[PDB]
Amino acid sequence: EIMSTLFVFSRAFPFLFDLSYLHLLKPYLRSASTIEEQRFLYYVVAIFRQVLPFQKEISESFLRSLESVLLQRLTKAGTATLMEIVPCLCSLFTRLNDYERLKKIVVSCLKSLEEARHSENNFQKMVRLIDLIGLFSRYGDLNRINDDWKHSLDFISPECDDAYVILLGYFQKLLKDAKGQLRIHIIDNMSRICLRETSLFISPLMLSTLDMIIAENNVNEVSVLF
Numbered sequence: 223e224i225m226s227t228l229f230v231f232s233r234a235f236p237f238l239f240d241l242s243y244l245h246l247l248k249p250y251l252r253s254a255s256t257i258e259e260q261r262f263l264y265y266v267v268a269i270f271r272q273v274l275p276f277q278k279e280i281s282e283s284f285l286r287s288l289e290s291v292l293l294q295r296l297t298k299a300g301t302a303t304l305m306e307i308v309p310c311l312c313s314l315f316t317r318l319n320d321y322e323r324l325k326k327i328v329v330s331c332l333k334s335l336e337e338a339r340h341s342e343n344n345f346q347k348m349v350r351l352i353d354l355i356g357l358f359s360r361y362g363d364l365n366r367i368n369d370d371w372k373h374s375l376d377f378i379s380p381e382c383d384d385a386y387v388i389l390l391g392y393f394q395k396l397l398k399d400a401k402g403q404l405r406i407h408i409i410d411n412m413s414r415i416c417l418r419e420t421s422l423f424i425s426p427l428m429l430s431t432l433d434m435i436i437a438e439n440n441v442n443e444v445s446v447l448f
Contacts, residue, residue: 225266225269228265232268236272236273236276238277240443244270254295261300264302264303264438265305267306270310271309289318289323292310293309301349308357308362310322312362313361331355351406352407352408356412356415360414360415386419387422387425390415390416390428393408393412396430402442416428
């Protein structure tokens with residue numbers, strides 16, 4: 223009930239947040255748990271990202287340390303909290319860091335994603351990859367350093383910088399060799415990654431996929447696409 227009002231003044235009217243209004247809770251924000259008391263964090267980080275961009279006031283020595291807390295805090299969480307952490311920290315790197323961590327780790331876990339279909343399924347742990355990949359790219363631009371990703375041309379072959387059409391191609395063939403909610407867990411973020419650059423959202427390789435999934439009439443599939 224307290225934090226219910228907090229979120230409200232976090233989204234609208236955000237330009238009134240003292241340093242201490244954060245700087246006292248910021249060490250408390252480190253407090254992480256493993257039970258229902260963790261779902262509390264969903265009422266934390268969104269307020270935090272609601273106030274970061276223009277009410278930063280972050281001392282240029284602390285911003286280097288904020289993500290150190292957060293990189294250590296993205297291991298295992300309810301899938302609900304994950305929709306806000308990436309929309310926070312991916313907005314923070316351009317405010318702190320270079321396009322390196324969201325480069326070096328993403329190309330690492332792309333190889334780890336290559337060893338996700340070409341491995342043990344882990345439909346409870348692949349979701350930590352099969353969604354996290356698109357989670358970064360949905361609200362984080364990839365029209366950036368990719369020569370090293372064009373150096374990862376080994377299995378991402380065809381054209382150019384536009385990973386997105388290839389990612390969608392790397393994923394378009396994943397809908398047939400799949401069986402069940404694996405298809406759901408991949409059809410959702412296939413739309414999510416394309417949501418950023420909607421210019422693809424009219425292109426044939428994805429439209430053909432849409433027509434393919436319409437004829438199946440899987441209620442669980444068509445619902446989550448809606």
